[PDB]
Amino acid sequence: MATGKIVQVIGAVVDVEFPQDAVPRVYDALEVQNGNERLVLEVQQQLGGGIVRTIAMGSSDGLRRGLDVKDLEHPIEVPVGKATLGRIMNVLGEPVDMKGEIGEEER
Amino acid sequence: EFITVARPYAKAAFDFAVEHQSVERWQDMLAFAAEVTKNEQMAELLSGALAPETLAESFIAVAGEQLDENGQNLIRVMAENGRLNALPDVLEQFIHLRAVSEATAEVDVISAAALSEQQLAKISAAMEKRLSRKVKLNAKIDKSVMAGVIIRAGDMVIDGSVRGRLERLADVL
Amino acid sequence: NSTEISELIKQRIAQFNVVSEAHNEGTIVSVSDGVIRIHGLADCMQGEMISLPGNRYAIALNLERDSVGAVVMGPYADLAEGM
């Protein structure tokens, strides 16, 4: 389930508020549906009560206030090992060479 | 200090209280809220970073003296803006807007000795002409001034004391 | 009423058990770039050593009117608002 909501969007910087139990830790990765397309946010700061300031790892345009945000409980983690040889990947470890899924065994 | 951030809230609370002819209930409700703000434990909670809709509810819990719709709504707005500490000033400016609306004023009269109660009658009769407002008086005594009287009405004062005459003579020379 | 108001306030606070911190204890309320803001610690003294979970220390540098700002002497990313 998704437990946070966007409260600001200023350029690339997005503020998300959680109930004060579930506040993500710093460098945790969040996720939100920016339209028909997924977008992940990396927590930079825990400021004030419940609110968390993040940097969007992607296009910020199209974000509304009040979108539901789901917090992955781990930092940005990428596929590793022999499976990645000869592939191209972006910062999130997704393939950008159009040869399809990576075939990772471990992240 | 919250003299400036209190003005909008006092004005809104008064304009609302007038529409419903409940000015007195609103004044007592604000006077209670501004008191719960002063308690030792609540003043601790108001400073720590709680989420607004949690701080507001914990504050509402401590008051059954607030008419559940319109007083609690004011508390919720002030909490959303992070201004619950401004209530002690919302109260003062509410009283001020009321005194203006009802054309009332309150004059301090400061003297070396208490007055003869005919002087007070003439003073009130005079000020109710200097000002359109029906005036209360608060007589006060101060033996630094030694004759005459000081009349202070708001930020206006009439320095009738002989102490003033002396200090104002000294600076002519 | 001016006195029984204060008494009723104290009573009703005791009812809902809103309470003050111990003087030697406090809660983190903000984390960023290795600096934390602590709420409480009424007895914290400038330059003191504050003991975090995980057997780590922070140095109290800013004793502001409502919170203590301290720098974390170690890895800080695992700290969280509430500890």
Exposure on the CB side of residue A75, measured as CA atoms within 13 A: 10
Q: C12–B42: do the CB atoms touch at under 8 Å?
A: no
Is the CB of C35 inside 8 Å of chain A's CB atoms?
no
Which of B129, B132, B139 shows the shortest CA–CA distance to B107?
B139
Q: A49–C82: do the CB atoms touch at under 8 Å?
A: no
User: What CATH number is given for B6-100 in this structure?
Assistant: 1.10.520.20
Sheet containing strand B149-153, strands side by side: B134-141, B104-111, B149-153, B156-159
d(CA B154, CA B131): 11
d(CA B104, CA B153): 11
Is the CB of B49 inside 8 Å of chain C's CB atoms?
yes
C-chain CB neighbours of A43 within 8 Å are none
Q: Would you give the DSSP letter of residue A82?
A: G
The answer to whether C62 and C68 have CB atoms below 8 angstroms apart is yes
Strand partners for B118: none
The answer to whether B107 and B127 have CB atoms below 8 angstroms apart is yes
Sequence-distant (≥ 6) Cβ neighbours of residue C55 within 8 angstroms: none
d(CA B154, CA B107): 7
Closest CA in chain C for residue B51: C29
The b/e string for A15-31 (b: 16+ C-beta within 10 A; e otherwise) is bbbbebeebbbbebbbb
Question: What resolution, expressed in A, was reported for this entry?
Answer: 3.1
Long-range CB contacts for residues C42-51, cutoff 8 Å, separation at least 24:
C44/C68
SS3 A6: strand
Query: Chain centroid to CA C3: how far?
Result: 31
Q: Would you give the DSSP letter of residue B85?
A: G
Q: C6–B61: do the CB atoms touch at under 8 Å?
A: no
Which of C62, C56, C30, C32 shows the shortest CA–CA distance to C44?
C62
C4 phi/psi in degrees, rounded to 5: -65, -20
The token pair at C34 is 């290795």
Neighbours of C, requiring at least 3 CB pairs below 8 Å, are A, B
Q: B62–C13: do the CB atoms touch at under 8 Å?
A: yes
Residues 33-52 of A with CB under 8 A from B: 48-50
The token pair at A29 is 């990765």
Place of tokens 């707005």: B77
Sequence-distant (≥ 6) Cβ neighbours of residue B173 within 8 angstroms: none
Place of tokens 């309150």: B106
Which pairing describes strands C56-63 and B104-111: parallel, antiparallel, or unpaired?
unpaired
**Interchain CB contacts (distance < 8 Å): A and B:** 10
d(CA A63, CA C7): 50
Which of B120, B98, B96 shows the shortest CA–CA distance to B109?
B120
d(CA C54, CA C51): 9
The token pair at B120 is 């007070």
d(CA B147, CA B161): 6
Angle at alpha carbon of residue C56, lines to C42 and C31, rounded to 5°: 65
Is the CB of B62 inside 8 Å of chain A's CB atoms?
no
The token pair at C27 is 């809660």
Q: B49–A48: do the CB atoms touch at under 8 Å?
A: yes
The answer to whether A41 and A32 have CB atoms below 8 angstroms apart is yes
SS3 A33: strand
A60 phi/psi in degrees, rounded to 5: -85, -20
Elucidated via: cryo-EM
Which of B91, B30, B29, B84 shows the shortest CA–CA distance to B52?
B84
Measure A47 CA to nearest chain B CA, in Å: 9
Beta strands in chain A (DSSP E): 4-10, 13-17, 28-34, 37-46, 51-56, 68-75
Which residue segments constitute the domains of chain C, with CATH numbers given? 1-83 (2.40.30.20)
d(CA C55, CA C83): 13
A-chain CB neighbours of B54 within 8 Å are 20, 49
Q: Where are the alpha helices (DSSP H) in chain A?
A: none
Residues in chain B: 173
Closest CA in chain C for residue B57: C16
Q: What CATH number corresponds to the domain at position A49?
A: 2.40.10.170
Q: What are the distances in angstroms from CA B125 to CA A29, B168, C34, C62?
A: 74, 28, 68, 58
Which of B69, B10, B91 shows the shortest CA–CA distance to B18?
B10
Measure C10 CA to nearest chain B CA, in Å: 7
Q: C31–A44: do the CB atoms touch at under 8 Å?
A: no
Q: B39–C16: do the CB atoms touch at under 8 Å?
A: no
- Round the CA-based radius of gyration of chain A to a whole number and report it: 15
Neighbours of B, requiring at least 3 CB pairs below 8 Å, are A, C
Strand partners for B140: B110
> Can you give the residue range of the structural domain that contains A34?
1-75
A-chain CB neighbours of B50 within 8 Å are 20, 49
AA identity, residue C48: E
Measure B47 CA to nearest chain C CA, in Å: 6
